[PDB]
Design a protein around this ligand. Sequence first.
Ligand SMILES: CCCCCCCCCCCCCCCCCC(=O)OC[C@H](COP(=O)([O-])OCC(O)COP(=O)([O-])OC[C@@H](COC(=O)CCCCCCCCCCCCCCCCC)OC(=O)CCCCCCCCCCCCCCCCC)OC(=O)CCCCCCCCCCCCCCCCC
Ligand SMILES: CCCCCCCCCCCCCCCCC[C@@H](O)O[C@H](CO[C@H](O)CCCCCCCCCCCCCCC)COP(=O)(O)OCC[N+](C)(C)C
Ligand SMILES: CCCCCCCCCCCCCCCCC[C@@H](O)O[C@H](CO[C@H](O)CCCCCCCCCCCCCCC)COP(=O)(O)OCC[N+](C)(C)C
Ligand SMILES: CCCCCCCC/C=C/CCCCCCCC(=O)OC[C@H](COP(=O)(O)OCCN)OC(=O)CCCCCCC/C=C/CCCCCCCC
Ligand SMILES: CCCCCCCC/C=C\CCCCCCCC(=O)O[C@H](COC(=O)CCCCCCC/C=C/CCCCCCCC)COP(=O)(O)OCCN
Lengths: 175, 606, 56, 52, 178, 459, 52
Amino acid sequence: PDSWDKDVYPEPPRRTPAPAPQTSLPNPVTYLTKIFDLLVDRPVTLAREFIEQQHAKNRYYYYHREFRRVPDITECEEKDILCMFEAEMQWRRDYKVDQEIVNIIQERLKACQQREGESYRQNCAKELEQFTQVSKAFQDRYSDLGAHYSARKCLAKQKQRMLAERKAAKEAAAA
Amino acid sequence: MNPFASLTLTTLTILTIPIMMSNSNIYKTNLYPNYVKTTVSYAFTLSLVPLLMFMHTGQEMIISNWHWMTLQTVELSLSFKMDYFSVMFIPVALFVTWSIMEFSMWYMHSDPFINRFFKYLLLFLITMMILVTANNLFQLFIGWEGVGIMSFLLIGWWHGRTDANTAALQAILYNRIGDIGFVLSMAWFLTHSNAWDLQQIFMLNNECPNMPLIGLLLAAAGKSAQFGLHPWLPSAMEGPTPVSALLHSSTMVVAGVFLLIRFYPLMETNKLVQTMTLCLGAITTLFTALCAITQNDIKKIVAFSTSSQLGLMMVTIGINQPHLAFLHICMHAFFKAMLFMCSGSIIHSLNDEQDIRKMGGLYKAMPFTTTALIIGSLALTGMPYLTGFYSKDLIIEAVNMSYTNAWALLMTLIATSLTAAYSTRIIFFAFLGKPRFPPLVLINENNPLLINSIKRLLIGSIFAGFIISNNIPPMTVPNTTMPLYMKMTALIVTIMGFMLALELNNTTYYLKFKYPSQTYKFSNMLGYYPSIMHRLPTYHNLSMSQKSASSLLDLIWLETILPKTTSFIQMKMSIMVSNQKGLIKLYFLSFLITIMISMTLFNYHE
Amino acid sequence: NVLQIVRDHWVHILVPVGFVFGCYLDRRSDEKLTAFRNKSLLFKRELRPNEEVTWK
Amino acid sequence: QQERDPWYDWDHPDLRLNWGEPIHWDLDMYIRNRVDTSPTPVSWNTMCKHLF
Amino acid sequence: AFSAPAAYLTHQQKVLRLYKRALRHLESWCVHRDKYRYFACLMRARFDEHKNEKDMVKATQLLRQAEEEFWYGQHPQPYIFPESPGGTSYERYECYKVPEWCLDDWHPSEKAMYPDYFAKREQWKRLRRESWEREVKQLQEETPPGGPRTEALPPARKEGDLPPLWWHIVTRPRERPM
Amino acid sequence: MLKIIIPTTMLLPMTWMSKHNMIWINATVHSLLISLISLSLLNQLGENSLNFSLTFFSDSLSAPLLVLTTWLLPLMLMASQSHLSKETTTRKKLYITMLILLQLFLIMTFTATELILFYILFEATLVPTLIIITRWGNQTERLNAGLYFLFYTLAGSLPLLVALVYIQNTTGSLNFLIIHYWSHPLSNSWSNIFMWLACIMAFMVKMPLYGLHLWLPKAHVEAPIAGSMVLAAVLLKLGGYGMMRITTILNPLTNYMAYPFLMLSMWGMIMTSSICLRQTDLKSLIAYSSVSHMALVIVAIMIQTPWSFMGATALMIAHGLTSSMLFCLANTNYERVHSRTMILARGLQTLLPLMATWWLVASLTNLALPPSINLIGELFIITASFSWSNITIILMGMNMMITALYSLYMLITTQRGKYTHHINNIKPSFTRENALMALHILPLLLLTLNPKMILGPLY
Amino acid sequence: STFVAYLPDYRMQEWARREAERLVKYREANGLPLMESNCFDPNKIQLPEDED
Ligand SMILES: CCCCCCCCCCCCCCCCCC(=O)OC[C@H](COP(=O)([O-])OCC(O)COP(=O)([O-])OC[C@@H](COC(=O)CCCCCCCCCCCCCCCCC)OC(=O)CCCCCCCCCCCCCCCCC)OC(=O)CCCCCCCCCCCCCCCCC
Ligand SMILES: CCCCCCCCCCCCCCCCC[C@@H](O)O[C@H](CO[C@H](O)CCCCCCCCCCCCCCC)COP(=O)(O)OCC[N+](C)(C)C
Ligand SMILES: CCCCCCCCCCCCCCCCC[C@@H](O)O[C@H](CO[C@H](O)CCCCCCCCCCCCCCC)COP(=O)(O)OCC[N+](C)(C)C
Ligand SMILES: CCCCCCCC/C=C/CCCCCCCC(=O)OC[C@H](COP(=O)(O)OCCN)OC(=O)CCCCCCC/C=C/CCCCCCCC
Ligand SMILES: CCCCCCCC/C=C\CCCCCCCC(=O)O[C@H](COC(=O)CCCCCCC/C=C/CCCCCCCC)COP(=O)(O)OCCN
């Protein structure tokens, strides 16, 4: 339905064929579907309608909490404990958000594989490359930090990678 | 909403209602087994409908209804896979369980704990359904261990019997040997694919390496009782006959084959693992068929038949024919359950006797049982247009027309001979000839429960092959062009087995006696595998566990090094320090020595 | 009638009173760490027209 | 314990032991739920050759 | 099972036991009744061939050779009666056997049901308590000073005496207790 | 945090002012109430810990341990009151006082912010346990067991004190927050190697590590039932908690300083699982199984991965509950027959069916049947080890097989077969024993529905 | 158990999911990469000037 955003969780237009009977024999699945409808789907719908009627009389709201952007660990001096603490909290929040992003991409990949059936190897290449890109980024950001991780160790890993890349680029410039 | 998901989940849900009522009053009455049987029958007739929906439109679904926990990037959810395999296997298992519980209502009538027996059967059914419908590896492991533990509890039903406890522990040991490989596969998949669910694993493993597939193969060999870990299935016959008919014949022992079928997209991308599976299946089926033809206990013969059929499922997996293997599972369930049911009726009629040497002429004394067993034996041997034809003969045809190991093909053919061989042995020794049982005849098969259940499985064993084969889409490319002699290979092999086994069985009427050959001794004693492997490794392991780990290290050397050395050293030093004679002469001499040292070794150093 | 039962069952108030006293002391301990109240760069806020503190 | 007489009237029938008798050092290894040393119809070191 | 064992088996007892084992294993080999009967009469004839031997040494050597022949030619899977120590139903009903002393721990509401049974059990308990001392005295009387030599027990010899050590033999639970 | 500590202290005058026939009732009721109050600490913030004050804080690691301790106290009281019926009122009050003091020291130990306070309470836990073992133990070997338990602990703990005061002198603080935020790498030097050893060996011997585990069978077998319950359930976890707290400052040295400890833990878990197969005493088997589980926990802590810490926390909680249940189950039979030999009483399922059901469930949880939290922790640790090295799976699978083997061996030996004939004093199970088993087992199964409560901070 | 089951979401998992949804929508609505290999901005990092 409209509860979740259709851009974060997209799906194809859901093309379905029309029934084209070829025999005079009656279809038992259609009769069973009608029986199931009349015996299950209508009482459930009525119960849900009553439940929604009761819910409408009591409407209240809950809000999504917004967090300001505080300075990160790069702009904290060596022994400033308060700035370090706030930067570490922000970094942990960002780590959780990145984990959830990877989770969303993985959900997309799983949905594509189930939906495409026998042609998943061809019709899920875009989801696969999206997951490859996000996985590489997440690995570069957070892998091998180990337990007792921190924003300082992430910064050290990033700086080591930057130094290696800069040395490689400089040595390629002389080639 | 689409009724498919609701019906598939309701079929699984309603099976747990008697488990919830197990604490209610109905569990204390004698109406509980009938209640459980009726619940299972209702579950079967409900599961029939999603099968019709799939047979019409090929509807498949996955339901991630409940989120359990999320570890970082990995999400664990209660998810059910409702593809062709689930929607086809659920009704067959429910049908077989319904028949077997109706049989148990008669077979286990005098058991004082019949309610507990039916509850255990229902728990096993629930765990097998969980195993079959699982979409991720954690849920499948839950079903794995649930059916394993239920098998342990049902094998040792008569817990006052030492051999039952021994067999249950043996089954647990072998299943955990396979579980080692299961856990290895799980760890590899989580570490390299970041998922336990089937969909992610398929997407991220285009070229599957050897480690996860070898782990899965080890798990399947453990669960399906292949040659390395075979002996526990024949020893599982310690349990009551319904347990052997349901768990260790047709439903639980196919779990390894089903696990390998669940991962066939990864299996078809690796040829080494396929070759290993094919070779293991071939050696298993031929070894078990060779062991079967010399056994005198009917349940042992049928259990070895089950093991040989499992080996056949492994070989048809090895030639990259997973759908054919699933079809074989579904087909074999019917007549193998029927064969155990007939054996149990025979056993109950002849005062709990299982040796075929004391089973005389029951062809006339037990007409319905004889007819059912003959039909089941013809289905097992691949008689055309029966249940066993549509799968076994296609399996032989596909094995013949594939780039396959020659030895595996030859061993499959010899096992096909031996199948008819031991079927002829069973029929000849159990139903023909003169009576050999004690004179007081208690033969009576005039009970509606037994007749109705065996009748239902007989109708299944007659028509299910045709109906199911004609009511599914083509998932395998047919072999249309083959040489005529090679088309008839299975039938020639079966007829040769029939003729030669019948000849050797007819020769025992002669008044001539000869000592057994060494090959007969090898076949009858199961190749001496339980004689050596159950005695040498166990003795060595327990002997090292006591002599070395317990006594040599913990009780002797770890004691010697840290605590006993400390105690000895402190005692010696205390004795040295405190044993003074109390004479001031010696003390003041030592005082002079100390003064001389302090003034020289210390007072000169500043 | 209540004198004797009080004298033999008065011990059942010690633990609830200890719990209440512990909560009270926890609030007092919270009262000593208000140096950065409404002072963090992440949660610094403008007071409502009638409120005196952001938390207590 | 599997080699002991099963028709004797043992004090402990399952255990196949008598009260007050000396107990083997490795009884828990030989409880007959476990390692069995009973004689076999075919000689040891002959079954090994055939199996191997 | 019921008889006190002797210090040793005589040559005659060993000979009969070997005869019975050979007959049973031959029946295992000879499935059919007529062929088994034929070969059993042949076995009986071969066994009676040395029936009247007087030299004990040659009889012992014949017994040893016969035992070797039996061991080489025994059936690897001989027929076993279901309730026999090797049968498929050997200890099947052991889990249903509950000792009689458990009935003393029953709740009085449980004993409200089945009143006559418990009255008769009280009668049996009084009988045992009133016979135990006489049983002990008789066992002390009829025993050599150097302790008993065999596991045999004497019967009752007086008017109202019961055989010593009878409670746990008479009060066996059952062979099919449930 | 005072709302938990103060009622625990109030438990002392309340039980010292109670009537001679009301001490058990009052102590059990108020211990259950305190456990209910302590259950409120499971609400964790995620990013950081709950810092109540300068002295105490709560973490996602500390909260399950605190709840386990508070829940274990009433079970200890329920198990104790049967074998202490003949005791005088003063001595029963002293026993309950020992239990309350142990609870207070444990709850303060898991929440201290600073390492010297943690060390002081972690050593203070010794005295009540020693008094319980050496005063209310049943056999004559309790004195030797207490000496082993005391000196094995202290020989490891004193170097930890020296290392802690040296570290505070060099860094200027030992507060865990400052320790974590100002962490600097440990160089490769002999001084740093010995600092690592002094910071590690105390928690090693409290686990216990294989080779330093000889005190555990003695102490756990020779202690009364409550002493064994608290030794297995809670006191073994002090080493693991200390390791998780202390390895923050030990990097990057742990990368190679952990090799001998990993080797010892894996091979010794194999050795202790094998030892359990040949054991004539029922309590020693449970003790050695505890040793194997704690060896697996040691491996998980040593490898330093988030999945490893999550699995270690889950395994600690699950092992505590399961080991306490198994010890209580053994104690019931010991009270029946007054002997610890496993083969003395056989076929107890025929006489005690519900206790046999409790035995079966405890044995199933001991072998980590899915989807119990025992297997959750074990599987997480095994996956982390596989990431560490693919060859660890051989030892993990061998340990799983042997664990299933001795668990079912114990179950079959104690419950199956035929009953011993001459033993005729096996009375029906009391309501107290069945209730104790149920109160052990039900939280275990309920934790399966919400596994994230015991997975720890790395979740 | 009821109290623990109905514990408020202080762990910020629903909040994290909503934040991730917002970030993903914003990033693929503009063609930006879903995640950067750099956790911190290279412009506020001052590496050592010379590497040789
Ligand atoms: C054109 C193509 C078409 C081909 C058509 C056919 C082709 C030729 C077929 C001929 C092949 C086998 C024929 C029958 C065999 C037995 C007949 C017989 O003579 O009986 C007497 C005797 C049976 O013993 P007994 O003393 O009479 O029994 C005592 C009482 O009677 C006990 O009585 P009881 O009451 O206990 O019960 C009796 C029971 C028990 O009877 C037994 O004891 C027999 C058990 C073993 C024999 C069963 C044969 C299966 C052999 C499979 C081996 C595969 C390779 C394994 C390699 C092992 C390596 C060590 O008998 C039965 O009920 C049924 C038994 C078997 C019947 C069905 C057999 C047919 C299947 C095999 C042929 C396949 C046909 C189609 C071909 C498919 C592919 C082209 O047999 C023997 O003494 C020898 C048997 C020969 C087995 C050889 C195994 C092959 C591999 C050997 C090793 C090779 C390597 C060299 C050594 C290593 C060097 C390093
Ligand atoms: C029963 C269980 C008890 C508990 C078990 C505790 C285990 C403690 C073992 C500690 C693990 C290793 C300790 C130190 C790591 C390396 C040790 C050494 O062998 O490595 C070499 C060291 O070289 C030499 O081997 C020096 C050590 C030789 C003297 C030590 C004696 C070892 C004999 C074994 C005695 C048993 C000890 C335990 C008693 C119970 C490395 O060469 P190098 O790179 O140059 O030196 C690195 C150090 N630097 C950086 C400061 C220079
Ligand atoms: C004997 C007779 C037996 C037969 C009778 C059996 C009857 C049926 C039995 C089967 C019942 C199956 C129940 C299946 C679960 C249904 C309810 C479940 O979904 O709720 C769970 C709730 O589980 C609890 O949250 C976790 C259990 C907490 C356990 C605490 C125990 C109390 C402490 C005791 C001491 C512990 C000591 C050790 C602690 C470390 C999961 O919650 P969640 O899906 O998320 O909630 C979604 C909606 N919310 C979030 C808004 C609530
Ligand atoms: C990969 C890791 C595991 C590999 C295997 C390592 C060896 C395992 C050693 C296990 C030792 C456990 C001993 C403790 C058990 C207690 C004693 C015991 O079980 O008794 C033996 C008991 C009784 O014997 P019965 O003959 O059935 O008695 C019936 C009439 N009385 O039977 C048993 O359970 C013994 C089981 C021993 C299994 C050991 C052999 C297993 C070898 C497997 C190798 C093949 C691998 C499979 C290859 C698959 C292809 C990929
Ligand atoms: C019950 C069994 C448990 C046994 C556990 C015992 C092992 C404890 C670990 C070693 C204990 C001593 C550690 C000392 C405290 C560390 C403080 C520290 O780091 O200071 C070092 C000092 O390092 C030392 O002096 C260590 C020397 C060792 C003294 C005692 C040796 C006894 C045996 C040691 C090996 C055994 C330890 C492990 C064995 C475990 C149990 C078998 C460097 O300081 P500086 O002098 O300032 O150097 C830098 C500026 N130049």
